[PDB]
């Protein structure tokens, strides 16, 4: 169908807020990765399309998603970047796995409502 920007914001923003509410797990995802500040200068050699919660929020607020699946794609891009870059024993990797569980749980009923 056609999804209006405010329809997408009302339906999808609560799912993003559910991720933001996760502490400690969302903290590494609340702002774009800053490789120099974090001391990980190889980051952009591995992650070609960075994504984080604040960028997704901005895209929702500025109507940059036409379809719900584009929002889901960006959330999963954020997750896949973190699993790609970080080691499986690291905080960010395990935090990512927790956020993916939370997101799966929240997005399902919302997608049912948007159908
Ligand atoms: C370990 C090098 O750091 C990272 C590496 C990779 C990635 C990504 C998103 O692939 C993010 C971080 N950043 C990060 C990590 C842990 C914590 C804990 C609190 N915070 S914080 C200051 O409250 O934001 C953290 C911020």
Curated annotation (Swiss-Prot):
Region (Interaction with histone): 42-88
Protein modification: Methylation of the KIX domain by CARM1 blocks association with CREB. This results in the blockade of CREB signaling, and in activation of apoptotic response.
Region (Interaction with ASF1A): 80-98
Entry's localization field: Cytoplasm; Nucleus
Domain Bromo: residue ranges: 3-110
Disease cited in the entry: Chromosomal aberrations involving CREBBP may be a cause of acute myeloid leukemias. Translocation t(8;16)(p11;p13) with KAT6A; translocation t(11;16)(q23;p13.3) with KMT2A/MLL1; translocation t(10;16)(q22;p13) with KAT6B. KAT6A-CREBBP may induce leukemia by inhibiting RUNX1-mediated transcription. Rubinstein-Taybi syndrome 1: A disorder characterized by craniofacial abnormalities, postnatal growth deficiency, broad thumbs, broad big toes, intellectual disability and a propensity for development of malignancies.
Domain notes: The KIX domain mediates binding to HIV-1 Tat.
Subunit: Found in a complex containing NCOA2; NCOA3; IKKA; IKKB and IKBKG. Probably part of a complex with HIF1A and EP300. Interacts with GATA1; the interaction results in acetylation and enhancement of transcriptional activity of GATA1. Interacts with MAF and ZCCHC12. Interacts with DAXX; the interaction is dependent on CBP sumoylation and results in suppression of the transcriptional activity via recruitment of HDAC2 to DAXX. Interacts with phosphorylated CREB1. Interacts with CITED4 (C-terminal region). Interacts (via the TAZ-type 1 domain) with HIF1A. (Microbial infection) Interacts with HTLV-1 Tax, p30II and HBZ.
Function: Acetylates histones, giving a specific tag for transcriptional activation. Mediates acetylation of histone H3 at 'Lys-18' and 'Lys-27' (H3K18ac and H3K27ac, respectively). Also acetylates non-histone proteins, like DDX21, FBL, IRF2, MAFG, NCOA3, POLR1E/PAF53 and FOXO1. Binds specifically to phosphorylated CREB and enhances its transcriptional activity toward cAMP-responsive genes. Acts as a coactivator of ALX1. Acts as a circadian transcriptional coactivator which enhances the activity of the circadian transcriptional activators: NPAS2-BMAL1 and CLOCK-BMAL1 heterodimers.
Protein name (database record): CREB-binding protein
Upper lineage: Eukaryota, Metazoa, Chordata, Craniata, Vertebrata
Range covered out of full length: 1083 to 1197 of 2442
